């Protein structure tokens, strides 16, 4: 068996927007992402799937059944997000705070108790109360709660993504506006102030790199505001760094609990030995730039004392690798591997690819954990790992294999504190809609019933034993190819 | 949930030759099938895989671990075979019995206590004692035991399959010789006499239709003696009928426990409505001919009182269908469906096909059960159902779907007394060797360790609850195609 | 054999931007499309392939070899475009013409001889002379020349597609600006004035529906300006209608030769009988709206005498169908058929799909020809038909099948005057770059050599005989599926 | 261009049994192969396809149209077989000849003019006259004729393959009987005596290695007599050696024209460098054993002066390779490459596989030619090369690639005198029936019409130019994989 420490957390991660709606009274129309996915032009263009989150899995109403399943599965932790748009559907700009802003730089944001009280008057009571209800229930199952403050949607008053898509950059511009940093610090303080008694650890945000990158660079991904603008991507990146740091400080003014961040990772593997330098450049550009900012205060060639040391732990999201080839002194991502595979194809390495076209590459998770650990020596939590797999064909192997790799990291001295699968149940996969099914539990979107995939039973074994048991260790292997789609050669 | 009666049996089936060998001291070289699969010409021709049973899963030595797994899985029954070749490695012809033989017809075989004693003197003691040991252990787990007397291999003294393949029909000729019927009655009496205290129900034989059909007609299948001879197929068929009837009588002279037979079934589905008559002709030729003989005494246009009423229950093996098309007043099996599909392909009905090229067709199991029930109203046991599936891609769906169909039969009044999956663990699939993996448990043929596939955990749910639970009912569905091999169009 | 009239034209079609560059001295950087495909953000986003037209097949320098091949193949016609950007790299706004503009409506544009002379002073001499050279050579081979004035790229002075993508709608805005209509009339007059002696028939433009639709609606296609704006799509559509009408008039003021238009067509086939109305709505929206404007003067619910009767012939481009399903009183295009198939997949109708994911549907060409003929009774020329097929797997069948369908139309009384394959040679497929290979001749982009695919030899048979000969008629069939990619199910 | 010498022959090869029947009056029921493929047990077993040669392409009646096509294609040679069964449907044993037989060894057979006259009295006049008619017509087209005496079927009076399959080895036993050697010498003399004026070169037999190997070893292939017997395979091999030598002598007693043999070849390629010795052992066993016998007189460890020097030229049949791995001091053929690939799959080398599962491996043809040339320095004729390819997907590439390799051999000094494609038209592929389509011309088996595949037009280019022309040289490449079936991984 491959045994984990007794305190090691096995759980799941979940987003508000992806999972909450679907039950009566749950609809939240007041986010950029909601507007974005309902936009007729986006739908007609195929930027978004045409599926809508209000037809989703209904965690808002059915949370007890989600928690029931998690408890039955032996899960001891959940990282779940709250939605800013629900809590502050109306603007909070007029709540005065003490913020030192020097042009593009937000150096501090102090949120007084008076401001918190004014925010409380402005907050949506049903929303914040409901979060307390859901998270209290969660805790009542013996599930440790990691609260993630931001998981992409912004209140519409902060971002009109259609206006921005259209190039009206005077419209509310989301992470292109330093105001959003300040409002986020306010929001983060407020949520900690309200909910801290339920929270074990905080994350400020989930995968900010996807926000800036898909929002402004990889615009075929259909993410808001889908405004192809490299400068904008950088501006959003910087504002997300600043938002993280200012939220860290605001939350720490309320609570001394650990405050971290959750980030989208790939293992950047060189196509050949000659591409090792290129792979390192990719890692820097795509990973260390953000972390060196919030850990070391290094951003854009200068060091900011107001950014340094603003991280207590690192949430590693990991799905697959990116294979990197040198291109001059730059680099390029090699198609056919990693995230760039044929959906339900096979990479040139012989690794099957998920329903999303993501390559089976568990070894990457060890590498990413090791690299983060060696660089910063901050505690690591695997905050996402999973697979789009409607058939549960690859998932059992995917699950055990990746858990094994976490064990390897642990054995080698990485302080990894848990593994959170993405996700307990199927949910709304953003621009892809509902057809990308990442759950251990299948969701019937008509009935809202949860259904256990066999991988859920495998995860129960792992979670209840805190081990890859002898019975299931064989799943630490690559899915046999013959029965799977071969894709195209 | 889909709930079964409290007495309903969930278990597994297993063959001696397929599962026993692999541990030291287990090798039994003294069967036709052993000679057959080691024959160099057969191997070179690709008639057999080149894999050998002595490299198998090792139930002979490791039975306790098989039983441990079954018990952990909640299984309440096992149908397991004994091997004639192990018990009587040397000829028993000289043991006198009272047999009325009129040419080709063996009308009676009475085995006296004196004969049983003489047989006991000739029997291999280690073999019979070891079977008692294994089956006693099996019973000690709360597992009901259905003993199946014959599961294809014959002692070599009864059948030199290489000589017969070569056309030397004066060599020991297996089921071409009425002597084999008589020796089988002796063997069956002997085994019942020795082991009855361990046995709940007896089966005389497993899939005799495969024996005669693959042995003498479908010779590319690589089954012994692989002597292409339609008359021989019929002769073997008749001798297997007679063997069944004479074993039934011999066993009943010792014990009043139920004595049945286990048979290979397909649902014969008409390609179009116009093929309904053709499908009925196929059912008669391939199924009712045997059963009308052993139930109604009807064979070859005449009725034999010595055949009538020689069946207490029917073991339904079922894997897939055969699609039938009229061809004149005859019929033909339509390729691309049923058993004749591309391995890991998809049929024209959109049904995925197993690693063996067998179509996903759970509805067939209901039909076969209903048809047997309507015709004979004898108790039915699903004695095999499973899938060759190295990845466990289709099996979870296959399992639940077929169990559901058994429930449907039950609900409609069919007396089906249990469901036995083929098989608990991977084993030697005859001419196909080890690459056809039917286990709920994967076998590592190097280490002999058993490994739980996720389907094993699903079956545990079913067996422990005697139900398709709400959590797993969704698996009563066709595996999603996109992620599976599409085959060729 | 399937024989065509002696005057029936067999030839090819070709675009300037797609085929001209690749030889020294050919580079034309002065178009929107050139800027667009070199734009770093577009490349990084995957909107465009990263391939560049200057690395193309080199018709500008190597035209004689293209013509040699066409002549060897027996081709009697070519429709080839000229590039506005080459001819007028600098703005022509200051050339005064008499234009009646009432807001959005350009009712007339008269281009005086004085204006033509002023244009001639402003024109790029090398460009216009070179076109004369190439087209004179073309004619010297016995090849009839259909000159197409516009095939998507605009001079950059008329359209800064990056500025528009960014939402700076005050930048030169291409078909969003009525000025472009007027400049196009000037350009069209100028080209006719210069080149008419070489021209048999004129087309004003190629597939304007792709320009407006991909430019402003189907923005994932990576066409300029990629500004998602439904109103803009309509504005561009109207301006392309007006441009067509004003070019028709301007060309007719110079020459009485036939002036037509070339349009992207699909056969809109109803998924079920219940979708017939929906299919008709699709045809109207996607086809009749434009043609009723330029034939009947009907646009936007009003009739314009300045639009009526502005068409002498219709160039039918046809590649595949679109399957249409009713959606309320609207309609939707059914994925998996037509243009929306898996690249190298197979549709649900069993029709193989090209390297572009376009379904094999030759019957559509008959339908489209018949429908146009029944509606307008204007002469039809199949101005494009071909397939992206790097292996020449489907093309031989595609070619003969579609030619057969043209014959069927002819036999039924449609005045179809010829068939022009897209294309003689591989070329730059817009945002897809060079990997979509439509040639009868394969191009080696390194050496610029032309290579005959077997389909070229089949087309030679057709063209030289003006018939589908007895030897090749069997190719009027669907490519056998077994050997082709099956795609995913 | 890749140019061949002016005398180099481009043509086709054809078998009597595979191509003759299908027209009224052509049916020849009097061969082992005819009986074999009509045998009900064989059909039911799937040993043979159920297709029958009498439904074939009808060369017997339609030869002029075959020749017309060949002439239109520019072909200058044909190797065509005659059928012993047609010429001597009744036994010729009673025609006395002078034969020195020492047990198994037939050391000489002298056929006197008197014997020839007696044979002529016994011959079927319609058959021999008809062959003269067909071959005279062939010659009238400028086509050089290579007559091949034997191409597998034997007269039934020499071989009752069903009796032998059944193990009745006292029945007429074909190549298991030295009598067949003697009768073959008689037959060969007779045919040369009758037809020599039409013949340029003789071949005694086609692929005798397939006869002995598939007949008695690879019995799943469904070749007669399908009697699994390694000793028999060796006996048949020796008798085919002897038959070749005695036919050589008998033909040389009549004519001094070149007498050769046609043999089934593979390039035996080592899987790794460590398998080079194993590959050499495979070549010896499968190729040099026969040729060292008929060239060097070396057979079974002894040298026979009556075998030495009995070969004037070597007919190389080549389709694909066999990949060989050492297995101890033996060797094994590696599945998934060469002849052992998935039909319409792709090998691990990335080479597409034909409809027969044969890997695209043109380099093998050079190797085989070079090896034969280096060993014996006898003139070589590529007597077969082609592909089962119903779609003509791979064939154009297959054709040009293999022709290129013949050129390479020539350039390197191999005396290769021509290239004969298998085949001009589709025909009956033995146990596989009609679905394996090897023609440059597709045959419609209903109408008997011949249809030109595009590869036929490519071959016309080659044959008329005696070159791989510049236009088609690109086809010397591997078919692009993306559009083809990927098979299974
Ligand atoms: Mg699975
Ligand atoms: Mg082709």
Automatic annotation (TrEMBL), chains A, B, C, D:
Q: Which parts of the sequence bind Mg(2+)?
A: 392
The record's top EC class is: hydrolase
Checking InterPro entries in the record gives: Beta-galactosidase (IPR053427), GH (IPR017853), GH_1_N_CS (IPR033132), Glyco_hydro_1 (IPR001360), Glyco_hydro_1_AS (IPR018120)
Please give the biological process terms from Gene Ontology that the record holds: carbohydrate metabolic process
Q: Which UniProt keywords apply?
A: Glycosidase, Hydrolase, Metal-binding
Determine the domain of life of the protein's source: Archaea
Cited NCBIfam families:
Beta_gal_BgaS (NF041004)
- Name of protein: Beta-galactosidase
Record the organism.
Acidilobus saccharovorans (strain DSM 16705 / JCM 18335 / VKM B-2471 / 345-15)
Q: What is the lineage of its organism?
A: Archaea, Thermoproteota, Thermoprotei, Acidilobales, Acidilobaceae
